[PDB]
Amino acid sequence: MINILMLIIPILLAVAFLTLVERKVLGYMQLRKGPNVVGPYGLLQPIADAIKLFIKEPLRPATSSASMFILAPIMALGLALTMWIPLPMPYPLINMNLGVLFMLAMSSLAVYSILWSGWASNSKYALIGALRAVAQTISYEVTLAIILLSVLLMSGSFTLSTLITTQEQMWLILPAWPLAMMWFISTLAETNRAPFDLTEGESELVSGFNVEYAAGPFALFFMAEYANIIMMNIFTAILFLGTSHNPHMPELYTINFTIKSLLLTMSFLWIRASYPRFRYDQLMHLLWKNFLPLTLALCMWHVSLPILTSGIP
Amino acid sequence: TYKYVNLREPSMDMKSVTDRAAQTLLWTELIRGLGMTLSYLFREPATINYPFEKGPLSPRFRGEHALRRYPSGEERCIACKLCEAVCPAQAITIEAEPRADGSRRTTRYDIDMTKCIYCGFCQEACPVDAIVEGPNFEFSTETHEELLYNKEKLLNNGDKWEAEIAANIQADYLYR
Amino acid sequence: ELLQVLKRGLQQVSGHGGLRGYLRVLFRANDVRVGTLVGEDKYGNKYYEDNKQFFGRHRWVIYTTEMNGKNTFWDVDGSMVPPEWHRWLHCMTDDPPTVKPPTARKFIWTNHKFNLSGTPQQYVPYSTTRKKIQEWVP
Amino acid sequence: RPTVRPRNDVAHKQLSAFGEYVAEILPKYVQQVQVSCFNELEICIHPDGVIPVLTFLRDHSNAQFKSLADLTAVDIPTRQNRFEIVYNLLSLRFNSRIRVKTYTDELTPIESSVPVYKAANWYEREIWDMFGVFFANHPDLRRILTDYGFEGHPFRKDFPLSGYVELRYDDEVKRVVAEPVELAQEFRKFDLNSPWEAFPAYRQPP
Amino acid sequence: VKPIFSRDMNEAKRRVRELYRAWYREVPNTVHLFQLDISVKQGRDKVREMFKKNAHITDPRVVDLLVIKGKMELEETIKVWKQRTHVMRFFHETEAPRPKDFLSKFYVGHD
Amino acid sequence: TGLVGLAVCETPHERLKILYTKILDVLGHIPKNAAYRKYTEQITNEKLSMVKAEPDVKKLEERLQGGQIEEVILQAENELSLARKMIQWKPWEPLVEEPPASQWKW
Amino acid sequence: EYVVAKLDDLINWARRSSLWPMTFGLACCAVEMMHMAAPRYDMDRFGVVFRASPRQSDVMIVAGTLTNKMAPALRKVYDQMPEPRYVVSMGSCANGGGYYHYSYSVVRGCDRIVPVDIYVPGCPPTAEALLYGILQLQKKIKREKRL
Amino acid sequence: NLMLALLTNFTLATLLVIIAFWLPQLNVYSEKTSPYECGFDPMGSARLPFSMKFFLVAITFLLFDLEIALLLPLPWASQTANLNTMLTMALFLIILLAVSLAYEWTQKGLE
Amino acid sequence: HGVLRLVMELSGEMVRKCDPHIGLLHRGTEKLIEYKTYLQALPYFDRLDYVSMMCNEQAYSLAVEKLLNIRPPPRAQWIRVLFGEITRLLNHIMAVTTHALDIGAMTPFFWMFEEREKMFEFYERVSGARMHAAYVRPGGVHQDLPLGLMDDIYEFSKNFSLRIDELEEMLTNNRIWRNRTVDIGIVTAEDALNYGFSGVMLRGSGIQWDLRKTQPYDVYDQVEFDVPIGSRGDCYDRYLCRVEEMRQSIRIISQCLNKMPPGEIKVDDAKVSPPKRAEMKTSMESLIHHFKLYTEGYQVPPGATYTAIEAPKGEFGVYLVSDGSSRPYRCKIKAPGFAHLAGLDKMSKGHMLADVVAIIGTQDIVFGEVDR
Numbered sequence A: 001m002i003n004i005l006m007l008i009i010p011i012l013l014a015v016a017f018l019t020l021v022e023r024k025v026l027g028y029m030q031l032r033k034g035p036n037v038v039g040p041y042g043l044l045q046p047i048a049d050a051i052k053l054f055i056k057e058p059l060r061p062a063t064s065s066a067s068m069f070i071l072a073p074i075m076a077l078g079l080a081l082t083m084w085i086p087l088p089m090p091y092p093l094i095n096m097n098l099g100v101l102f103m104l105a106m107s108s109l110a111v112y113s114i115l116w117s118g119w120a121s122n123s124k125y126a127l128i129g130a131l132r133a134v135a136q137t138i139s140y141e142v143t144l145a146i147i148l149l150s151v152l153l154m155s156g157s158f159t160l161s162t163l164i165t166t167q168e169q170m171w172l173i174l175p176a177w178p179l180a181m182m183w184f185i186s187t188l189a190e191t192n193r194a195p196f197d198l199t200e201g202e203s204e205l206v207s208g209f210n211v212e213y214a215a216g217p218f219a220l221f222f223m224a225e226y227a228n229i230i231m232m233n234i235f236t237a238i239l240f241l242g243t244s245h246n247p248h249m250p251e252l253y254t255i256n257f258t259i260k261s262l263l264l265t266m267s268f269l270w271i272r273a274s275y276p277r278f279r280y281d282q283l284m285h286l287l288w289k290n291f292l293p294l295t296l297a298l299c300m301w302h303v304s305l306p307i308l309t310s311g312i313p
Numbered sequence B: 001t002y003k004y005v006n007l008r009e010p011s012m013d014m015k016s017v018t019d020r021a022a023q024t025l026l027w028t029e030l031i032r033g034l035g036m037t038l039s040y041l042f043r044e045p046a047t048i049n050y051p052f053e054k055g056p057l058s059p060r061f062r063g064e065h066a067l068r069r070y071p072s073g074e075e076r077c078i079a080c081k082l083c084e085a086v087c088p089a090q091a092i093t094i095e096a097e098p099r100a101d102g103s104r105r106t107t108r109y110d111i112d113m114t115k116c117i118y119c120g121f122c123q124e125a126c127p128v129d130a131i132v133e134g135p136n137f138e139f140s141t142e143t144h145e146e147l148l149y150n151k152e153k154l155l156n157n158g159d160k161w162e163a164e165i166a167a168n169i170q171a172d173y174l175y176r
Numbered sequence C: 001e002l003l004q005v006l007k008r009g010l011q012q013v014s015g016h017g018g019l020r021g022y023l024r025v026l027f028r029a030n031d032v033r034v035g036t037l038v039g040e041d042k043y044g045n046k047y048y049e050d051n052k053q054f055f056g057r058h059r060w061v062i063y064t065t066e067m068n069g070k071n072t073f074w075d076v077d078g079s080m081v082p083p084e085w086h087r088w089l090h091c092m093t094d095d096p097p098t099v100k101p102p103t104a105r106k107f108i109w110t111n112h113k114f115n116l117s118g119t120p121q122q123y124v125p126y127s128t129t130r131k132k133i134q135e136w137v138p
Numbered sequence D: 001r002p003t004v005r006p007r008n009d010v011a012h013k014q015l016s017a018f019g020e021y022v023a024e025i026l027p028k029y030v031q032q033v034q035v036s037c038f039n040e041l042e043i044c045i046h047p048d049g050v051i052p053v054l055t056f057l058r059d060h061s062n063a064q065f066k067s068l069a070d071l072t073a074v075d076i077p078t079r080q081n082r083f084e085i086v087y088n089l090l091s092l093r094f095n096s097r098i099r100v101k102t103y104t105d106e107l108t109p110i111e112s113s114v115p116v117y118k119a120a121n122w123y124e125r126e127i128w129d130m131f132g133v134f135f136a137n138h139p140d141l142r143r144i145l146t147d148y149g150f151e152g153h154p155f156r157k158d159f160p161l162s163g164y165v166e167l168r169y170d171d172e173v174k175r176v177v178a179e180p181v182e183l184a185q186e187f188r189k190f191d192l193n194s195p196w197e198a199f200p201a202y203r204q205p206p
Numbered sequence E: 001v002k003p004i005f006s007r008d009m010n011e012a013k014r015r016v017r018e019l020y021r022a023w024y025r026e027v028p029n030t031v032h033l034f035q036l037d038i039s040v041k042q043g044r045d046k047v048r049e050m051f052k053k054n055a056h057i058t059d060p061r062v063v064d065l066l067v068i069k070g071k072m073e074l075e076e077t078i079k080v081w082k083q084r085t086h087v088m089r090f091f092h093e094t095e096a097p098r099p100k101d102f103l104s105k106f107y108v109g110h111d
Numbered sequence F: 001t002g003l004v005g006l007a008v009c010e011t012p013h014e015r016l017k018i019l020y021t022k023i024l025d026v027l028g029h030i031p032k033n034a035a036y037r038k039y040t041e042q043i044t045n046e047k048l049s050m051v052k053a054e055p056d057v058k059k060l061e062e063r064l065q066g067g068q069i070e071e072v073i074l075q076a077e078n079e080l081s082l083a084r085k086m087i088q089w090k091p092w093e094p095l096v097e098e099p100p101a102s103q104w105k106w
Numbered sequence G: 001e002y003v004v005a006k007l008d009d010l011i012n013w014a015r016r017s018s019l020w021p022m023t024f025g026l027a028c029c030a031v032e033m034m035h036m037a038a039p040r041y042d043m044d045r046f047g048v049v050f051r052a053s054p055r056q057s058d059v060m061i062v063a064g065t066l067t068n069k070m071a072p073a074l075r076k077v078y079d080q081m082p083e084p085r086y087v088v089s090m091g092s093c094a095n096g097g098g099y100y101h102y103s104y105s106v107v108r109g110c111d112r113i114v115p116v117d118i119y120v121p122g123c124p125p126t127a128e129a130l131l132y133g134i135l136q137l138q139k140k141i142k143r144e145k146r147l
Numbered sequence H: 001n002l003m004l005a006l007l008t009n010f011t012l013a014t015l016l017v018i019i020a021f022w023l024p025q026l027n028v029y030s031e032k033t034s035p036y037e038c039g040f041d042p043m044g045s046a047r048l049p050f051s052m053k054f055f056l057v058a059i060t061f062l063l064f065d066l067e068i069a070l071l072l073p074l075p076w077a078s079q080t081a082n083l084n085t086m087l088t089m090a091l092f093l094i095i096l097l098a099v100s101l102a103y104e105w106t107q108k109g110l111e
Numbered sequence I: 001h002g003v004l005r006l007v008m009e010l011s012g013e014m015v016r017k018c019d020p021h022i023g024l025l026h027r028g029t030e031k032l033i034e035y036k037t038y039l040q041a042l043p044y045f046d047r048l049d050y051v052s053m054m055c056n057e058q059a060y061s062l063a064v065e066k067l068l069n070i071r072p073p074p075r076a077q078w079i080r081v082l083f084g085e086i087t088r089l090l091n092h093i094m095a096v097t098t099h100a101l102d103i104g105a106m107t108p109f110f111w112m113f114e115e116r117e118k119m120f121e122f123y124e125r126v127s128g129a130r131m132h133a134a135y136v137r138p139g140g141v142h143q144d145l146p147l148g149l150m151d152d153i154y155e156f157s158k159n160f161s162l163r164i165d166e167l168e169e170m171l172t173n174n175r176i177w178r179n180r181t182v183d184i185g186i187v188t189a190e191d192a193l194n195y196g197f198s199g200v201m202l203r204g205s206g207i208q209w210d211l212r213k214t215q216p217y218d219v220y221d222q223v224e225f226d227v228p229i230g231s232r233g234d235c236y237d238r239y240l241c242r243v244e245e246m247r248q249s250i251r252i253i254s255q256c257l258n259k260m261p262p263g264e265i266k267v268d269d270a271k272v273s274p275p276k277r278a279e280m281k282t283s284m285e286s287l288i289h290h291f292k293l294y295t296e297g298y299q300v301p302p303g304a305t306y307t308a309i310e311a312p313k314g315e316f317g318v319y320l321v322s323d324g325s326s327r328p329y330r331c332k333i334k335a336p337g338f339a340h341l342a343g344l345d346k347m348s349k350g351h352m353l354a355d356v357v358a359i360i361g362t363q364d365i366v367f368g369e370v371d372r
């Protein structure tokens, strides 16, 4: 097998080259110059951080825990980078018997990275950032499965290969008009660089899964946390975008698929700079109280539609 | 005068209620807020990179201390203990002895950078205009000993900044 | 509108240097810009000016390679440029070698020195007074 | 006068009526000395009852001050009685400023202003820290502007400006930061005092 | 009867005793909860020498003022506040000079 | 209608008249020769006559308050508490306490 | 011989490339420390990225006055830093009290608590002068590990 | 192979930890602290319950997650079975979930 | 915002009792000024606060002006308001930018700091220092306005009107702020008056009171002032009033630009204010008074005085006690920092950890205030 090794090393570079965009686009959004000194346009700085944070930075926590803690950055990468495997792409690595089920299960398993980092420090200061990270993720897992079901019943089955073929004339944004707007919010269930987000950034509280971790484990967390942002951006570009298929020419698909994802890649960092944090209590009131009755009403609506007019795979 | 922050409900009936409900149901005004930083991305940044470009300043500016001298040699400082008394940090120290024969100008002259809040007080209090503040920025040391100025000497080595000082003081006499 | 924007970038690279000159203003220099130059400076500073761009900006200026004895082209600091900081770059409008005359004193240092910081021949503290004298005779 | 005088006195006659109004009540328990100069009023109060004076000026119909915003204390060793707690008061409906003072040595406990004013307790903590004046029936007397293991009171004129314990080295001990080292850099004691009195009328007979 | 302070001359003696009991129970608690530092046995002797220096008893005003001051510096661990092993350490560790000899102090040249 | 403060301006007239009539009786218990009774009464009697003359107009609120009736009611609500405290602690009637040491000049 | 000597400079190039500061909100110096993030005089991804947390950062900037109440606090933060660490004491308060110095509470010069590598003398530390505090830092990192 | 695909990603991830574990080493002093992030000594030593606040909302998720799993047949089951018989039953589970959330509106909790 | 210990007592996650063990930044300005002269003690007031520069010393110099009973020159009075309103452009920006940064907003901090760095150019051109300058003195104003400022202030204010309203289209109209900051720490009763916040809070919600209209300092009531007063004591209305202060601040600056009498910068008395450089070199009396305004400087008339000028955060209650000598023995700067931190016992009752952060920003407890 060569394909897996050709989907980790160039992918870790994409999370590395993200650091440019994380302060270049975000910089111009705030009217400030980002990467400039290090490279021609600061292009040598993202690869410099790998030399900076791993080879020279040494920390291990004080009071600590036993085997757990250092188990958590292994759980961070080894569950978020595996998410690249079930992706349909032009051609998938081992096409699943049911596609999106593996995508939804491993995403919830990726939440454990911020959960086990609560017991990284035995001291109570770190676990407050963990307990906040529970509720900021636990509620949004409800709608994430429901809004999927309304799209999946509209087009094909759980298999991700069928989701490419179903969009031949028009996108799925237009039939699922309120549901597409939900997937700019529901995608930010995992601790991502955003305005909605979770307990990961500083601002008000101490940094979750970062105050306990070093540099080396803490550096490994960013290579997983920012990796999930690309993952949700690609996953939205499958469920809601498509444009064309073309099995004969893979070259025409690969260029067209990347532009659609890159426009969404900018959009989350667009969200991050623009708006403040939603608060621990009031994020639980955005969904559950307000958005859950809306999504279920649309779920009720999407059950009737294949019966009203023929729509069965 | 009263400006009033309270709007007292903008919505009333039919047309005024539905548009206020439309922005809360979906987004609209958040997309309007999204477009606010869109134009901010389009306009050029007002950024200055230091190793090549330099920032704006003023003709009268205070940095690192340097004492001046007359056009035909001689120390301009007369030794008063004046600037010592004005100094709120008491960073400047002065002790004086007669210079061989005739002239009586300084022996000990230390200005500690461990203190000094940069007032321009000693620049203003000096009757002979000895300490004239130049537009200095570059000062970085390994130890405190290297940081604090010795008996004149390094302060006398302000000759490399005295060419700018002579241009700056031309804006000082008959003030601005 | 679009054709003039691409032509402006190509003319900037063609004007300043060429092929090897453009790479020196990209790898070593942070921002690349071409315009008017003052020219005359001690050691070998370029000193460029007369550019619109933005408020409180007077072109690239650029630092010289090996000013006194540092022997560095990649490393540059604010130690560069002679007694001329009060004009062109900041405060004054008149150019230091073109219009504004430097005042002669025959006491000021002829050769400009860079700050050593970590390097030998740097700043030092020294005693001043001879203090109370003590004497003992056999 | 064009630049000589700051402001002409016109409201001073109306402000002098306040100095008579409180004095018309005439308590030896409260009043004592009333001083009024430069558009302001100053009253000093007998130590035995301070709380009944603080309930006055607040609520009262003729003088509705209520807000007892600023709370200072004077350090002076000239008198037989040392410290002097000074209250600064402001009215929002009436628009006037009045001053309340205490005269006692106040090394012995003094009455608290916590039942009258809600923010005064934080200012009361400042006085106990800097001077050493205890307030009777005070809820939670915590240290604010002093170190956790600080001896004495850091503001008193009786002890030096540099302090007894001030210098903190890391030295040979791995984590414990030192305290007992007492030497510091020399503060130049200016012995300057100009001959001839600058002002008339301020001179007192021996 | 001015000023009250807190208690009478005889009652002030038992107010210090009440303060002593609360602080005597805290020296085993300031090792396990805080830091190892020195010792439990040596810690108790450090308490006893502090009260011996303050022992005079002549006015009720002086004694009662020491109680309120004692209900802050020794209350620093009662409700559990941060000292960071730098505070609460009363005895000097890095200070080693204890010379009381006309012969000892004069050789070092002082005063 | 809404008041500026947290206390809501409730539509109640003669409510202000109750509290001012209550405090007049409290003053005539212990102090009579003292000036505290004689000086507070003339302010209250002048204020009570203004309420009787004006029929629920904003001009009645503009008479020595100018922040509606709700702000004036707060001064009357705490008036009973201060009058009872003045009667409890003897200071207005009695004057016999000691004076401080002769020193004032700085 | 030559590969070994250049590899040590490659590790030192990473510290020459980027260093993350600590947001010590200690005094007025911290306001000018916020001006490093301000666009006009920027080190934002020029070599400085603000993130806080003493465990992740490489450089801590002591931005103002330190007292006896703060001496135990700052000391263990420096101990919470990874072993390749640099301290930049910026301002006259950081160098030995702006005024103060002869005061009771203020600890003199930071060096009594935590050792300093680069000194910035400026009270209102002008952002122009502040830029040396990071540029000279990168220049001071020359050689590490010979054997 | 699914097993060979998952293990190769997992083994490469744990190997990167070892690189950051063994290379940087010089000194390990008694310098690392329990709380970090803000500084000072930890007032809350070890572990203490805290709890509450979100106790009702968290419990309801465990109850709701089972129903969404029972909603997963919808796109995959409706292929062979009769639609008219399913329509009454498929909506039935979604209707009752809105009824349970309607009972959640009458006092939601402390959250 | 650093140096605010805030030891929390939580029954779960919400706050029951909040006791801030503050005063960690106690630099000890009180005892330190006692050994300094009035001219020597001047720049301490600037280095008290971190945001306000010309609003500080303003309270201090006026206290010396009330002690000596000597009026500043009419030109200097108009510069003091022009720079008194220019500090409000710095303070109320930090009351928004760092406050939004405390919540989680990244944009607005860098939206206004480019403006703020342009704002310090006005400080640099008027006095040799960047931030804190001994520009405001008991002799009115130290130095004249240069010719390259009045053209710059007018050019800056003309472009500022659109720049401030860009924050409202970004922050106020959004659902996020109207969801979060609304209904946090609603204190407007007689208890709010029993804490005494002076500037904002009471001004921000409830009582229609300000010193700007009631108690004039240096040529006031002549300049048209607009005071924003809200309805509810919540964090959102306490934020809106500060933004409405910023939109109604340019009116004061524009009126200060139009109304300028050409004349004197310092007072004619050489006993209080130092003479000109050309003046001292020729005439005798000027140089001796220049010599004597240092060492033992001003010579203050004895008597206790208390002055307060409305800060953008609250009030500077400077209380100077005077002797025969030119050393002021003890003074207390009664900044609102002590008043705002005292309110946290009531503000944090029944609130989460995340919005306690928002309380600090809306109160704007810049810890430079907390010293005396």
Ligand SMILES: NC(=O)c1ccc[n+]([C@@H]2O[C@H](COP(=O)([O-])OP(=O)(O)OC[C@H]3O[C@@H](n4cnc5c(N)ncnc54)[C@H](OP(=O)(O)O)[C@@H]3O)[C@@H](O)[C@H]2O)c1
Binding pocket: none
């Ligand atoms: N085991 C014990 O604790 C013990 C027991 C009994 C007696 N002692 C005595 O106490 C002393 C303890 O010292 P230590 O072992 O703690 O010192 P150390 O840790 O070995 O430190 C010595 C330092 O000197 C430098 N150095 C020494 N020799 C050098 C050379 N030939 N070339 C270049 N640099 C050199 C090293 O620098 P680089 O690292 O840069 O090379 C090193 O940092 C010993 O000398 C021993 O005689 C120790």
Ligand code: SF4
Binding pocket: B076, B077, B078, B079, B080, B081, B082, B083, B084, B094, B125, B126, B127, B128, B129, B130, B131
């Ligand atoms: S610097 Fe000026 S004031 Fe100071 S001693 Fe020298 S001549 Fe006198």
Ligand code: SF4
Binding pocket: B083, B086, B087, B088, B089, B090, B091, B092, B111, B115, B116, B117, B118, B119, B120, B121, B122, B123
């Ligand atoms: S600028 Fe101020 S602190 Fe510095 S030496 Fe001069 S008088 Fe002293």
Ligand code: SF4
Binding pocket: B117, G027, G028, G029, G030, G063, G064, G065, G090, G091, G092, G093, G094, G098, G122, G123, G124, G125, I047
């Ligand atoms: S050095 Fe100056 S600017 Fe910096 S904290 Fe001290 S007083 Fe403030």
